[PDB]
Amino acid sequence: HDAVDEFINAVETYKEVEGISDKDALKGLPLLFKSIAVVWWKGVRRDAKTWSDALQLLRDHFSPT
Amino acid sequence: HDAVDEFINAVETYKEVEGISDKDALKGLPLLFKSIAVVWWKGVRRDAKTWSDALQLLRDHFSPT
């Protein structure tokens, strides 16, 4: 139940829900989740001041519009 | 159910299971999950050749010994 196990569950859930192949996943998912993680950390070191505002922020950054 | 939502669930599960405060979590968890993500990507661009070997790898890197 450590952080690494929860990280892997996220990646594997996403691979499953999106029906991504093992080959496309190996090629693509490490950089995608690396980008998410960097953006989250970047937006906390820049702006966010709260825990709820650190979560919400990452969403608004990957926004539908 | 996108990647960002699964990422947030991982972080929030970890915060909950470990009983981390909002203040310690804001300060600490973005860099921790950023590190995990970087290590995973690093170990795929270096060594791993398979999907099961990309998962397993990240574990062995955060190894108990």
Author numbering:
A (entry chain A), B (entry chain A): 9 to 73
Q: Mind quoting what the paper says about this structure?
A:
In our 1.90-Å crystal structure, dArc2-NL is a domain-swapped dimer, in which the second and third helix of the canonical lobe domain join to form an extended helix. One layer of the dimer is formed by α2 of each subunit, which pack at a cross angle of 140.7°. The other layer is formed by the remaining helices, and α1 lies in a groove formed between α2 and α3. The subunit interface of the dimer spans 3440 Å2 of buried surface area. The interface consists exclusively of π-π and van der Waals interactions, and the helices encapsulate a hydrophobic core between the monomers, formed by Phe51, Val55, Pro74, Phe77, Ile80, Trp84, Trp95, Leu99, Leu102, and Phe106. The solvent-exposed surface of the dimer is charged and polarized; the electrostatic surface potential of the side formed by the two coiled α2 helices is highly positive, while the opposite surface formed by α1 and α3 is mainly negative. Only a part of the tail (residues 37–45) was included in the dArc2-NL crystallized here, reflecting the fact that our experiments were carried out before structural information for the capsids and the importance of the N-terminal tail was available. In our structure, this fragment could not be resolved, due to flexibility. The binding surface for the N-terminal segment is buried at the interface of the dArc2-NL domain-swapped dimer. Taken together, the structure of dArc2-NL reveals an intrinsic property of the Arc lobe domain to form alternate dimers via domain swapping, possibly regulated through interactions of the folded dArc2-NL core domain with the N-terminal tail.
